[model samples]
Target chain A: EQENSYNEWLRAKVATSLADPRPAIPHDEVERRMAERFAKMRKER
Target chain B: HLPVLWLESADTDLDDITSYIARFDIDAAERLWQRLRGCVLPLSEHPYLYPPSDRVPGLREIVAHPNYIILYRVTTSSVEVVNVIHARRQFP
Candidate 1:
């Protein structure tokens, strides 16, 4: 498989946060947004 | 590279090692076998034997032909890849 989804959550969020330099929400928030963003991101995919 | 155009940092955790191969349980000895498997046999030879079998399964040892002593460590669900290094190097 080219990409695995469970792992992709970490992959995409790391990518997005890096791309958006708005000083990522926060570490704890980063983890929460990771879950939130991944949930939303996967649904869109 | 990551999902986006940017490069993703490579990470090695215990989980990445075993999950990539998905063949056996994570442990000291099994980690040694995994490294041995990573060794590529040179096809340039008229005939070849990669390594005598007994040389594996315990303490890390470099393959006689290519000559590298790999290293590793493990976590609850992962096996971290240490290095695919050569025996000639100063350190493990």
Candidate 2:
């Protein structure tokens, strides 16, 4: 039942994202959201 | 340019990876996060740049990090990020 639920979860997550009409996010934005401690480490241009 | 829509599972996957790695090496965790995020950025401009997934039909996979694979699909209008999974993990 557990593994089954995991599979179900995956299917649902995929289906919902596909149906979502919200504006898709900018790629670079998620990069920054993937942010910080290393944020300072990067050689900023 | 097409934008990227992602599933929360993918976001959770990134968090799980970073949290686990950061427990020991903070820098490596940070680099992994940045790299994984940075590598996928190109998909916004070139959605089909990556090949189709051998394991999953109708999806494309990008090995953004050595141990991680990004699963996404393009639907003419935008790129949909399906999941972020580990190299060895069995995906559904």
Candidate 3:
């Protein structure tokens, strides 16, 4: 019962978000910074 | 170019993760957050690289950590991150 309700909640929220699109950081910068952080994360592990 | 749109729930998801781990090790919590953030950031370029979740139409997921999956959707102009959940967690 709990899992079922949680799934329903998740789907409802996700569907709501998908209905709208918003602005974000520039594409290149996002990729670059993420790449840097990803490498750092890997190194830490 | 596609950008990443993070829903408010995604913030809650991150909060859930960090808050849980912070009590044990703050560095580990920060690293986990950084790792998940990095994992999802690439959705801007290759949103479809991850497979769709069978539980929900249009929802895709990528593994951000051994225990966590970052769920998202590919929209017309942006990638929308829906939530993050543990791998072992049950969903529809």
- Best by the TM-score measure: 2
Cα lDDT of model 2 by residue, A1-45, tens digit: 666655555556566655656655555555656674345434431
Report every candidate's CA lDDT.
0.30, 0.69, 0.68
DockQ for model 1 equals 0.02
Model 2 stretches astray by more than 4 angstroms: A1-29, A36-45, B90-92
Candidate 2 DockQ vs. native: 0.22
Q: Residue by residue across B13-82, what tens digits does model 3's lDDT show?
A: 6666666675676678777877877887677678789998876777887888888888888877788777
* Error in Å for residue A4 of model 2: 15
lDDT of 3 at A12: 80
| Candidate 3 structure lDDT | 0.68
**Model 1 misses residue A26 by how many Å?**
26
Order of all candidates by lDDT, from best down to worst?
Answer: 2, 3, 1
- Residue range with the least summed lDDT across 10 consecutive positions in model 2 chain B: B83-92
Best by DockQ: 2
Error of 3 at B70 (Å): 0.4
Regions of model 3 farther than 4 Å from truth: A1-45, B90-92
